[PDB]
Design an enzyme around this catalytic site. Structure first.
Site, PDB file in Angstrom:
ATOM      1  N   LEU A  17       0.811  -1.213   0.000  1.00  0.00           N
ATOM      2  CA  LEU A  17       0.000   0.000   0.000  1.00  0.00           C
ATOM      3  C   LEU A  17       0.846   1.266   0.000  1.00  0.00           C
ATOM      4  O   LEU A  17       0.376   2.335  -0.387  1.00  0.00           O
ATOM      5  CB  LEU A  17      -0.921   0.016   1.223  1.00  0.00           C
ATOM      6  CG  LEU A  17      -1.942  -1.115   1.340  1.00  0.00           C
ATOM      7  CD1 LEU A  17      -2.654  -1.043   2.680  1.00  0.00           C
ATOM      8  CD2 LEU A  17      -2.943  -1.054   0.198  1.00  0.00           C
ATOM      9  N   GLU A  19       5.257   2.838   1.086  1.00  0.00           N
ATOM     10  CA  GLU A  19       6.551   2.678   1.735  1.00  0.00           C
ATOM     11  C   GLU A  19       6.565   3.565   2.974  1.00  0.00           C
ATOM     12  O   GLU A  19       5.976   4.647   2.973  1.00  0.00           O
ATOM     13  CB  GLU A  19       7.691   3.057   0.787  1.00  0.00           C
ATOM     14  CG  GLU A  19       9.064   2.571   1.229  1.00  0.00           C
ATOM     15  CD  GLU A  19       9.201   1.058   1.181  1.00  0.00           C
ATOM     16  OE1 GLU A  19      10.032   0.514   1.937  1.00  0.00           O
ATOM     17  OE2 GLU A  19       8.486   0.415   0.382  1.00  0.00           O
ATOM     18  N   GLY A  20       7.222   3.106   4.036  1.00  0.00           N
ATOM     19  CA  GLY A  20       7.308   3.885   5.257  1.00  0.00           C
ATOM     20  C   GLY A  20       8.535   3.594   6.099  1.00  0.00           C
ATOM     21  O   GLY A  20       8.648   2.531   6.707  1.00  0.00           O
ATOM     22  N   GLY A  23      10.853   0.079   5.994  1.00  0.00           N
ATOM     23  CA  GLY A  23      10.066  -1.048   5.524  1.00  0.00           C
ATOM     24  C   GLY A  23       8.777  -0.664   4.822  1.00  0.00           C
ATOM     25  O   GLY A  23       8.280   0.453   4.961  1.00  0.00           O
ATOM     26  N   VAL A  25       4.704  -0.999   3.698  1.00  0.00           N
ATOM     27  CA  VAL A  25       3.408  -1.258   4.317  1.00  0.00           C
ATOM     28  C   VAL A  25       2.523  -2.002   3.325  1.00  0.00           C
ATOM     29  O   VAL A  25       2.449  -1.644   2.151  1.00  0.00           O
ATOM     30  CB  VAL A  25       2.715   0.045   4.762  1.00  0.00           C
ATOM     31  CG1 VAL A  25       1.397  -0.261   5.466  1.00  0.00           C
ATOM     32  CG2 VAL A  25       3.633   0.850   5.669  1.00  0.00           C
ATOM     33  N   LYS A  39      -9.851  -6.591   7.509  1.00  0.00           N
ATOM     34  CA  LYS A  39      -8.861  -5.968   6.642  1.00  0.00           C
ATOM     35  C   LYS A  39      -7.914  -5.141   7.498  1.00  0.00           C
ATOM     36  O   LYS A  39      -8.356  -4.347   8.325  1.00  0.00           O
ATOM     37  CB  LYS A  39      -9.532  -5.087   5.587  1.00  0.00           C
ATOM     38  CG  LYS A  39      -8.648  -4.752   4.394  1.00  0.00           C
ATOM     39  CD  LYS A  39      -8.379  -5.990   3.549  1.00  0.00           C
ATOM     40  CE  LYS A  39      -7.575  -5.666   2.304  1.00  0.00           C
ATOM     41  NZ  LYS A  39      -7.304  -6.891   1.498  1.00  0.00           N
ATOM     42  N   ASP A 130       6.383  13.383  15.070  1.00  0.00           N
ATOM     43  CA  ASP A 130       6.194  13.401  13.620  1.00  0.00           C
ATOM     44  C   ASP A 130       4.733  13.649  13.233  1.00  0.00           C
ATOM     45  O   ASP A 130       4.188  12.970  12.366  1.00  0.00           O
ATOM     46  CB  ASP A 130       6.681  12.080  13.006  1.00  0.00           C
ATOM     47  CG  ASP A 130       6.840  12.153  11.493  1.00  0.00           C
ATOM     48  OD1 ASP A 130       6.955  13.273  10.950  1.00  0.00           O
ATOM     49  OD2 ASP A 130       6.848  11.085  10.846  1.00  0.00           O
ATOM     50  N   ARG A 134      -0.125  14.167   6.664  1.00  0.00           N
ATOM     51  CA  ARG A 134       0.169  12.906   5.991  1.00  0.00           C
ATOM     52  C   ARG A 134       0.137  11.737   6.971  1.00  0.00           C
ATOM     53  O   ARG A 134      -0.067  10.592   6.571  1.00  0.00           O
ATOM     54  CB  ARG A 134       1.537  12.970   5.306  1.00  0.00           C
ATOM     55  CG  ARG A 134       2.697  13.153   6.271  1.00  0.00           C
ATOM     56  CD  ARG A 134       4.024  13.308   5.549  1.00  0.00           C
ATOM     57  NE  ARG A 134       5.091  13.689   6.473  1.00  0.00           N
ATOM     58  CZ  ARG A 134       5.332  14.936   6.869  1.00  0.00           C
ATOM     59  NH1 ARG A 134       4.583  15.938   6.427  1.00  0.00           N
ATOM     60  NH2 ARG A 134       6.324  15.186   7.713  1.00  0.00           N
ATOM     61  N   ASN A 135       0.341  12.032   8.254  1.00  0.00           N
ATOM     62  CA  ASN A 135       0.369  11.003   9.292  1.00  0.00           C
ATOM     63  C   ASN A 135      -0.934  10.926  10.088  1.00  0.00           C
ATOM     64  O   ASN A 135      -0.988  10.296  11.144  1.00  0.00           O
ATOM     65  CB  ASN A 135       1.547  11.246  10.239  1.00  0.00           C
ATOM     66  CG  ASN A 135       2.889  10.971   9.581  1.00  0.00           C
ATOM     67  OD1 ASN A 135       2.979  10.202   8.623  1.00  0.00           O
ATOM     68  ND2 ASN A 135       3.939  11.600  10.093  1.00  0.00           N
ATOM     69  N   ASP A 148       1.630   6.969  13.121  1.00  0.00           N
ATOM     70  CA  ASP A 148       3.025   7.098  12.714  1.00  0.00           C
ATOM     71  C   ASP A 148       3.899   7.718  13.805  1.00  0.00           C
ATOM     72  O   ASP A 148       4.704   8.615  13.547  1.00  0.00           O
ATOM     73  CB  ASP A 148       3.115   7.924  11.426  1.00  0.00           C
ATOM     74  CG  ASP A 148       4.296   7.528  10.562  1.00  0.00           C
ATOM     75  OD1 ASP A 148       5.333   7.114  11.123  1.00  0.00           O
ATOM     76  OD2 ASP A 148       4.183   7.622   9.321  1.00  0.00           O
TER      77      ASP A 148
HETATM   78  C1  LIG Z   1       0.097   5.484   9.104  1.00  0.00           C
HETATM   79  C2  LIG Z   1      -0.746   4.442   9.793  1.00  0.00           C
HETATM   80  C3  LIG Z   1      -1.071   3.255   8.880  1.00  0.00           C
HETATM   81  C4  LIG Z   1      -2.594   2.948   8.867  1.00  0.00           C
HETATM   82  N1  LIG Z   1      -2.872   1.853   7.952  1.00  0.00           N
HETATM   83  C5  LIG Z   1      -3.212   2.158   6.576  1.00  0.00           C
HETATM   84  N2  LIG Z   1      -4.464   1.945   6.121  1.00  0.00           N
HETATM   85  C6  LIG Z   1      -4.796   2.236   4.841  1.00  0.00           C
HETATM   86  C7  LIG Z   1      -3.841   2.771   3.947  1.00  0.00           C
HETATM   87  C8  LIG Z   1      -4.052   3.152   2.468  1.00  0.00           C
HETATM   88  O1  LIG Z   1      -3.053   3.598   1.942  1.00  0.00           O
HETATM   89  N3  LIG Z   1      -5.246   3.063   1.616  1.00  0.00           N
HETATM   90  C9  LIG Z   1      -6.559   2.569   2.000  1.00  0.00           C
HETATM   91  C10 LIG Z   1      -5.207   3.522   0.211  1.00  0.00           C
HETATM   92  C11 LIG Z   1      -6.027   4.852   0.163  1.00  0.00           C
HETATM   93  C12 LIG Z   1      -7.212   4.823  -0.780  1.00  0.00           C
HETATM   94  C13 LIG Z   1      -8.048   6.120  -0.683  1.00  0.00           C
HETATM   95  C14 LIG Z   1      -2.538   2.979   4.479  1.00  0.00           C
HETATM   96  N4  LIG Z   1      -1.435   3.531   3.682  1.00  0.00           N
HETATM   97  C15 LIG Z   1      -0.170   3.745   4.309  1.00  0.00           C
HETATM   98  C16 LIG Z   1      -0.188   5.134   4.955  1.00  0.00           C
HETATM   99  C17 LIG Z   1       1.156   5.469   5.573  1.00  0.00           C
HETATM  100  C18 LIG Z   1       2.289   5.313   4.593  1.00  0.00           C
HETATM  101  O2  LIG Z   1       3.515   5.434   5.294  1.00  0.00           O
HETATM  102  C19 LIG Z   1       2.274   3.954   3.878  1.00  0.00           C
HETATM  103  C20 LIG Z   1       0.920   3.625   3.278  1.00  0.00           C
HETATM  104  N5  LIG Z   1      -2.269   2.666   5.764  1.00  0.00           N
HETATM  105 MG   LIG Z   2       4.280   8.233   7.414  1.00  0.00          MG
END
Ligand SMILES: CCCCNc1ncc(C(=O)N(C)CCCC)c(N[C@H]2CC[C@H](O)CC2)n1
Ligand SMILES: [Mg+2]
Ligand SMILES: [Cl-]
Ligand SMILES: [Cl-]
Ligand SMILES: [Cl-]
Ligand SMILES: [Cl-]
Length: 248
Positions: A17, A19-20, A23, A25, A39, A130, A134-135, A148
């Protein structure tokens, strides 16, 4: 942390989904104790599970995988937020097809949610280090929660020295408010990262957005006072935002 650990067999990993940090995600499925599957998002610690607040992302658990060579590779299980991060959501709203034009009332509610989340962490003397749009993640009920836990978000004292307190989180919160009020602008337009310290040191701060209320700008501005002690607490900021919202 023998409580937070989850059996690896209960977890299914899918696509990446995002990068963070150190590592990637990934999406995934977590089979729960009630037989159903949930999910989830998997980052490829026990105290975070003690956190319990609707405006703070909850830790579902952690798994450890043993690779073919026996190398351990720990994984943090977090809830799946289909609406994604707030920063991206704000930008989409400016376009058609994406969500509607977000009114001021809804924008303030985003700020309140974040303030409520930070108020919770601040009371437990936990530093975020942080905080930014975005977080912040959007839940299915469109409530915001912080996660985050970047020069243009770091407080002036946190740049000069390695000092960091809740008053530093307040500073970053002020910037987050600005991101929201501007619907996703990058802080300090026309100013580069390497110029930030001297820029702030000379007394300059984030400018007021065009259609932003004076009362609202006063709140976020109070977060950027040079002396951290002059900045209000999250409990103060939260009530100020709440009162301002109800006045509409
Ligand atoms: C930062 C906390 C992580 C929470 N978990 C999470 N849940 C969903 C997504 C996501 O990207 N979706 C559903 C796609 C959006 C469609 C509108 C997600 N993405 C991460 C966010 C933080 C980033 O560092 C990596 C990707 N994370
Ligand atoms: Mg982040
Ligand atoms: Cl898997
Ligand atoms: Cl979306
Ligand atoms: Cl922009
Ligand atoms: Cl600015």
């Amino acid at each position: 942390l023998e409580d937070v650990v989850i059996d690896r067999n209960l977890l299914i990993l899918g696509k990446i989904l995002g990068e963070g940090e150190f590592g990637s995600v990934m999406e995934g499925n977590l089979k729960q104790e009630d037989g159903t599957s949930l999910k989830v998002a998997v980052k490829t610690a026990a105290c975070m599970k003690d956190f319990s607040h609707p405006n703070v992302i909850r830790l579902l658990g952690v798994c450890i995988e043993m690779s073919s060579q026996g190398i351990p590779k720990p994984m943090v299980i977090l809830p799946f937020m289909k609406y994604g991060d707030l920063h991206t959501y704000l930008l989409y709203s400016r376009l058609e097809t994406g969500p509607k034009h977000i009114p001021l009332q809804t924008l303030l509610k985003f700020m309140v949610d974040i303030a409520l989340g930070m108020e919770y962490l601040s009371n437990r003397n936990f530093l975020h280090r942080d905080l930014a749009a975005r977080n912040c993640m959007l839940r299915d009920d469109m409530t915001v929660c912080v996660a985050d836990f970047p020069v243009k978000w770091i407080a002036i004292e946190s740049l000069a020295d390695r000092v960091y307190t809740s008053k530093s989180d307040v500073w970053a919160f002020g910037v987050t408010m600005w991101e929201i009020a501007t619907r996703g602008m990058t802080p300090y337009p026309g100013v580069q990262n390497h110029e930030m310290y001297d820029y702030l040191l000379h007394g300059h701060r984030l400018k007021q957005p065009e259609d932003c209320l004076d009362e609202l700008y006063e709140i976020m501005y109070s977060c950027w006072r040079t002396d951290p002690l002059d900045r209000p607490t999250f409990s103060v900021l939260r009530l100020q935002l709440e009162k301002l919202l109800e006045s509409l």
